[PDB]
Amino acid sequence: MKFDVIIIGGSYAGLSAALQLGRARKNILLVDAGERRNRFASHSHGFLGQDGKAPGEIIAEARRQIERYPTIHWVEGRVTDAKGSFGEFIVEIDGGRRETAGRLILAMGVTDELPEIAGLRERWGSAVFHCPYCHGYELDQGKIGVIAASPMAIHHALMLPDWGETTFFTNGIVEPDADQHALLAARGVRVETTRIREIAGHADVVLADGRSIALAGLFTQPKLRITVDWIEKLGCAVEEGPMGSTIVTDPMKQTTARGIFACGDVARPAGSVALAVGDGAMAGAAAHRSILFP
């Protein structure tokens, strides 16, 4: 039957949304495909109360708690289509199954598209990362590499000295100007301009000139993709730039489409678990308020 809210995506953001709506006893459906952005990492860091915990265990415990609310409904599955408008949205699940709802919350996360460097992808989440707060500390102030992939490369490079002795591999992507050259030096960054052939060993960068640089870990900047083809038909504006796509939201997490809210990495290009949880909580309350004061 017609749900009050369908939440598309059931990880940190979508669960945090569900929790608020279940405590308000609203009739909601969480639909989740179970492929979370941090599945590649062994331990989560930086989220208060859970620093060090396995990312899947944080989820498992959140779920045990959220399942105690009988108005929260759950389907494991993937939304293959969604359409309609305020008060009458229609969602298709696994190309079969169809459900309807008066409001939608989009909490799908993003997928990371990485530079095309042999060896890099296999190492994602174990020796190659994107977020220094997330995974820099445990490199124990060893040698750290930063691979340019994006316009922002130099900014990311200037951050990593606070975590170890940093080498910035421009990889033909970026050529710093005199002021950038001067700043990289003062901040103690080694700038390596030789192209990268592959990542080998734990996090050894093999350069095109034959040299190999042994590092404790590597960071680069992924391009973020939203992996559904139906956002346009719902009518939400999406911000599209060199580092990927983000659903536009206001400070209350409403998208440009009435009745549709978004939260988590799908709506924040530099997200974290702490922020997904915060933004999901806001999105659940805002959707509730849209039902109370329509």
Ligand X SMILES: Cc1cc2nc3c(=O)[nH]c(=O)nc-3n(C[C@H](O)[C@H](O)[C@H](O)COP(=O)(O)OP(=O)(O)OC[C@H]3O[C@@H](n4cnc5c(N)ncnc54)[C@H](O)[C@@H]3O)c2cc1C
- In the complex, the residues that contact ligand X under the rule CB under 6 A are 8-14, 31-38, 40-41, 44-47, 78-79, 107-109, 112, 125, 129-131, 134, 228, 264-265, 271-274, 276
Residues 31-60 that bind its own copies (CB under 8 A): 45-52, 58
Out of 3, 129, 163, 219, which residue is the one contacting its own copies (CB under 8 A)? Answer: 163
Out of 122, 162, 175, 240, which residue is the one contacting its own copies (CB under 8 A)? Answer: 162
Is residue 228 part of the contact set for Mg ion (CB under 5 A)? no
Task: Give the 3-state secondary structure of residue 170.
Answer: coil
Decide the pairing of beta strands 128-129 and 143-147.
Answer: unpaired
- In angstroms, the CA 168 to CA 176 distance is 11
Q: Which of 41, 14, 264 is nearest to 134 (CA)?
A: 41
Residue nearest to ligand X (CB): 264
Name which of 130 and 288 has its Cβ closer to Mg ion.
130
Residue keyed to tokens 């060199």: 242
Out of 12, 129, 168, 261, which residue is the one contacting Mg ion (CB under 5 A)? Answer: 129
**Helix, strand, coil % in the chain, rounded to nearest 5:** 25, 30, 45
DSSP one-letter code for 59 = H
Task: Give the 3-state secondary structure of residue 3.
Answer: strand
Q: Is the dihedral of CA 238, 155, 36, 128 positive or negative?
A: positive
DSSP 194-219: SPEEEEETTTEEEETTS-EEE-SEEE
According to the annotation, is 45 in a ligand binding site?
Answer: yes
- In angstroms, the CA 263 to CA 255 distance is 10
Name which of 70 and 96 has its Cβ closer to its own copies.
70
Count CA atoms within 13 Å of residue 288 on its CB side: 17
Task: Give the 3-state secondary structure of residue 147.
Answer: strand
- Residue 40: CB minimum distance to ligand X, A: 5
Applying CB under 5 A, the span of 134-142, 149-157, 190-198, 208-216 interacting with Mg ion comes to 134-142
Q: What's at 245, amino acid-wise?
A: S
Contact 2, 101 (CB under 8 A): yes
Contact 169, 191 (CB under 8 A): no
Q: Which does 206 bind (CB under 5 to 8 A by kind): its own copies, ligand X, Mg ion, none?
A: none
Applying CB under 5 A, the span of 74-82, 127-135, 153-161, 276-284 interacting with Mg ion comes to 127-135
Is residue 272 part of the contact set for its own copies (CB under 8 A)? yes
Name which of 189 and 276 has its Cβ closer to ligand X.
276
Name which of 107 and 131 has its Cβ closer to Mg ion.
131
Task: Give the 3-state secondary structure of residue 5.
Answer: strand
Name which of 126 and 194 has its Cβ closer to Mg ion.
126
Q: Which residues bind its own copies (CB under 8 A)?
A: 12, 15-16, 19-20, 23-26, 45-52, 58, 61-62, 65-66, 132-133, 136-137, 141, 158-159, 162-163, 251, 272, 274-275, 277-282, 285, 288, 292-293
Binding-site residues for FAD sit at 11, 13, 32, 35, 37, 45, 79, 265, 273
Q: Which residues bind Mg ion (CB under 5 A)?
A: 129-131, 134-135
Binding-site residues for Mg(2+) sit at 130
